[PDB]
Amino acid sequence: TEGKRVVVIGGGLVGALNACFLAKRNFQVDVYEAREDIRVARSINLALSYRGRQALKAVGLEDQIVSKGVPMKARMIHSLSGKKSAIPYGNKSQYILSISREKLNKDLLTAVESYPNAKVHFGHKLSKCILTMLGPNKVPRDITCDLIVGCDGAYSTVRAHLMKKPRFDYSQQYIPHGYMELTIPPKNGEYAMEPNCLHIWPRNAFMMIALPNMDKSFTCTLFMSFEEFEKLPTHSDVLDFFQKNFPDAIPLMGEQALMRDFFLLPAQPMISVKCSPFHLKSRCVLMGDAAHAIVPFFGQGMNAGFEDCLVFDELMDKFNNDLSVCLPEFSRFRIPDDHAISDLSMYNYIEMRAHVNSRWFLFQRLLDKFLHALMPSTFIPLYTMVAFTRIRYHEAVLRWHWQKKVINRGLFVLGSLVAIGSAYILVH
Amino acid sequence: TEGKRVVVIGGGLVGALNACFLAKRNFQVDVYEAREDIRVASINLALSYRGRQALKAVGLEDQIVSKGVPMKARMIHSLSGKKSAIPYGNKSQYILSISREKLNKDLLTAVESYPNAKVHFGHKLSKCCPGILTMLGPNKVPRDITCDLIVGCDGAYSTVRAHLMKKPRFDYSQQYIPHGYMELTIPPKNGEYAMEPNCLHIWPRNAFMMIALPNMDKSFTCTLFMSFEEFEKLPTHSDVLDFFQKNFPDAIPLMGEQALMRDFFLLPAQPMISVKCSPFHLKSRCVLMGDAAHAIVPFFGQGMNAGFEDCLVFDELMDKFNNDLSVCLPEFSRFRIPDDHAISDLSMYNYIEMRAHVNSRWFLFQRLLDKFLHALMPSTFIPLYTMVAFTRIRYHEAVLRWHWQKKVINRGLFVLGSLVA
Ligand SMILES: Cc1cc2nc3c(=O)[nH]c(=O)nc-3n(C[C@H](O)[C@H](O)[C@H](O)COP(=O)(O)OP(=O)(O)OC[C@H]3O[C@@H](n4cnc5c(N)ncnc54)[C@H](O)[C@@H]3O)c2cc1C
Ligand SMILES: Cc1cc2nc3c(=O)[nH]c(=O)nc-3n(C[C@H](O)[C@H](O)[C@H](O)COP(=O)(O)OP(=O)(O)OC[C@H]3O[C@@H](n4cnc5c(N)ncnc54)[C@H](O)[C@@H]3O)c2cc1C
Ligand SMILES: COc1ccc2c(c1)CN(c1nc(C(=O)N(C)c3cc(Cl)c(F)cc3C(=O)O)c(Cl)s1)C2
Ligand SMILES: COc1ccc2c(c1)CN(c1nc(C(=O)N(C)c3cc(Cl)c(F)cc3C(=O)O)c(Cl)s1)C2
Ligand SMILES: [Cl-]
Ligand SMILES: [Cl-]
């Protein structure tokens, strides 16, 4: 019905979105957010794709977010040699777009407040032992409800309770790599690079990507194993490194501001958490990074959490607001998918260490483009499937494996027919 | 050295043993056991080389080995009623059935045999720090206590570990497997053992499995593994009987025809939990051992044995490096984690293998095949189970050698097979 009450832990990206979706069903939705309100007081800007956008669309916020974003119509690949090679995101109608973390969060907290049947209680934490604190600490004044939604991010308190509950599978892995942000400013008030591209500098042990902001700049994030981060404790090491591996960056970024920004704070650890199931007896449910913290190697963390919100809302339609049905159906329907994108993201991260240089990224993608054009749509590349559709993640993995099977089997018969065809036309 | 104090959290198998090892180098060791003294207030399990070697190091091999029953072979009960004995490797090589409780008691007694050791029954732990908060005999008596070392030996659902889990660069995972387990008893028959008393008795089915281990009174304790789903479908005696008649037919006459009913409905199927974590320590002040650090699924007879080995390998290090905990704690994690992960893995592999590829017959063929090739080459083929059960070859090295063999044979017999035919 309308006048059941729900509390959302976390006023983050997913927390705020879910609040809107719920408010939009006339729930009494109270949001509790640890930090102080960001509109007065981890990444900087993220890649927003179809799944996130479809979820934004259901609350009528797609347009507002889309407008403050910069499109990325292509990948732009910065070879070691220096060669700049571009490859499009799918067809001409399909483009991911770069948006800012903060702008995204802010418009969302304001969208929460636009529903009079929704409030957002800033400066309220959830303590380690189910009490929500007020402004002044040790003011234990929690208050009960028909639903508690954990959107408290990757280091979720709500999940920490659920972990002690029974038949709850859970896993948390810090990967060897860490990430650090570095800005490319405008060169004479204009973007220093082609601004409707995702920029990549793919090496083997290291990786840099850069995404465009509106103020004509880019924010780059740098992935390398904490190992190498150890080996560059001095400014000469950093410079030496950038000169060796990232030749064209130094002019683009500030050659001396590079050094202020690198040593500003330490390479950030990336965490992977899986768990199952996502719910508990129609009283509690996890969502987004609280349910699934993935390594950031597919541009899907926020998108998938946004999609969680949506898939819930679809089930609330499909089962007339029965929480006792929706909560188990969410776990059943969605866990397979959220696990799959987790795996994909991890795999990508592994691939990224073994073999991507300037050259293989191009071959691998242009091969995929070759085969889509060859046999559309019986081959849709993976990156298209995740980025520009709502095909379920695990189905996308399936299709992706099957396809890979028929490319390998297909290539084999042609290799063999070459291999007998050459011999026959060599003997006679 | 004698100046330093250590707290062992848990007075179970690993706690009690570790407390001995530690007491035996004059630490002030205090064991804190949340249960009451079991000597005044897996019923039984499979002891082997690794555990025995640890026990030996502390002068308790003999005592424990006396109250155990040698198991010189596996004995496989096929659905037909056929009974095939597969030996353990060699005549010297045999595993032995012992009681969890006797084992625990003798060790609690050994702990107290040291004047510099104490065990504190009815004391639980709340919270700790690298200064800890233990609960008195009376609940809500949270006195603080301090030490130079805190040893998590508090089992699979470990409090100490729950603290380490919050720290940075700490990988952890728990997974409840889908089967639970239940103990049943095969009593004595006319005062004698109802089956060959020096075997590990197996009844392998696919969804199910039962094993049985001989006690000293002339009985066996069975542990039955089946999926919680299946357990759900047997609420009434008639159903249990009808099930048993299908799947384990020679059991209804072996077991108390209605002892089965007493024991089966005594309490519910127990869950099995795999937990893995890394690393096993927190900077020279806190270490995990046994199931605090590695709760493996009970399908290789090795959980107690590995955790016993932990205590020994810690000791080996404390010897190597003159009792420096700053060195021994990192070296513990560095040396032991790969091994303890390997045995966990082996176990789960086994647990899955049992769910498809073993009915009655493959167990016989796999083992006899294996034994042909060891006999053929006594130092290049040592079978897996021999390496774990009867040696201290490191677990991960045993997995290495095991895969290696598997390949040189797959290779060498795809060669004989494909080339000459
Ligand atoms: C380097 C990097 C790059 C990324 N790039 C992309 C990308 O290109 N595209 C994409 O889709 N995703 C990306 N992501 C993923 C994205 O950051 C997350 O998926 C997204 O933030 C999830 O939203 P959330 O609300 O679940 O978590 P969060 O955004 O972390 O929100 C959690 C909120 O809960 C609050 N909170 C926490 N604990 C408590 C408590 N106890 N009580 C009350 N409140 C609490 C926090 O203060 C915070 O406000 C990236 C992540 C990283 C790290
Ligand atoms: C069905 C089954 C079969 C098995 N078969 C075999 C086998 O054949 N061979 C083999 O080697 N191993 C076997 N095992 C494994 C064996 O049971 C365990 O390895 C062993 O008990 C681990 O010892 P531990 O002391 O670490 O754990 P435990 O024996 O669980 O000891 C933990 C102790 O700490 C106490 N404690 C817990 N929390 C606290 C707290 N907060 N404060 C104070 N005290 C606390 C508990 O009361 C308990 O007494 C089997 C296990 C099962 C379930
Ligand atoms: C800090 O903000 C961040 C951090 C990481 C990412 C993003 C924003 C956005 N990124 C996206 N990745 C894909 C993708 O499908 N894959 C396989 C790729 C993966 C990597 Cl790592 C890459 F460099 C390019 C592609 C590619 O194909 O463009 C998208 Cl689609 S968007 C990753
Ligand atoms: C409740 O008490 C329990 C529970 C499980 C076990 C035991 C006692 C003792 N068990 C031992 N397993 C091995 C072993 O090496 N393997 C791989 C085997 C694994 C299984 Cl499941 C099996 F049935 C036989 C063998 C076998 O070969 O004997 C030993 Cl060696 S001892 C498992
Ligand atoms: Cl992400
Ligand atoms: Cl075990």
Curated annotation (Swiss-Prot), chain A:
Positions of L-kynurenine binding: 75, 89, 348, 383
Species of origin: Rattus norvegicus
Pfam families in the cross-refs: FAD_binding_3 (PF01494)
Family the UniProt entry places it in: Belongs to the aromatic-ring hydroxylase family. KMO subfamily.
UniProt note on tissues of expression: Highest activity in liver and kidney. Low activity in spleen, stomach, intestinal tract, esophagus, heart and lung.
Binding-site list for FAD: 14, 32-35, 47, 101, 126, 157, 289, 302-303
More details: Increased in neuroinflammatory conditions. Inhibitors are investigated as potential neuroprotective drugs since they lead to an increased level of kynurenic acid, a neuroprotective NMDA receptor agonist.
Cited function: Catalyzes the hydroxylation of L-kynurenine (L-Kyn) to form 3-hydroxy-L-kynurenine (L-3OHKyn). Required for synthesis of quinolinic acid, a neurotoxic NMDA receptor antagonist and potential endogenous inhibitor of NMDA receptor signaling in axonal targeting, synaptogenesis and apoptosis during brain development. Quinolinic acid may also affect NMDA receptor signaling in pancreatic beta cells, osteoblasts, myocardial cells, and the gastrointestinal tract.
Domain of life, source organism: Eukaryota
Domain topic, free-text comment: Transmembrane domains are required for enzymatic activity.
Localization terms from the record: Mitochondrion outer membrane
GO molecular function ontology, one term from the record: NAD(P)H oxidase H2O2-forming activity
Sorted UniProt keywords: FAD, Flavoprotein, Membrane, Mitochondrion, Mitochondrion outer membrane, Monooxygenase, NADP, Oxidoreductase, Pyridine nucleotide biosynthesis, Transmembrane, Transmembrane helix
Catalysed transformations (reactions): L-kynurenine + NADPH + O2 + H(+) = 3-hydroxy-L-kynurenine + NADP(+) + H2O
E.C. numbers: 1.14.13.9
Gene Ontology terms describing biological process: 'de novo' NAD biosynthetic process from L-tryptophan; anthranilate metabolic process; cellular response to interleukin-1; cellular response to lipopolysaccharide; kynurenic acid biosynthetic process; kynurenine metabolic process; L-kynurenine metabolic process; L-tryptophan catabolic process
Membrane topology term: Multi-pass membrane protein
Gene name as annotated: Kmo
TM spans (from-to): 370-389, 410-428
Cofactor(s) needed: FAD
GO CC entries: extracellular space; mitochondrial outer membrane
Full protein name: Kynurenine 3-monooxygenase
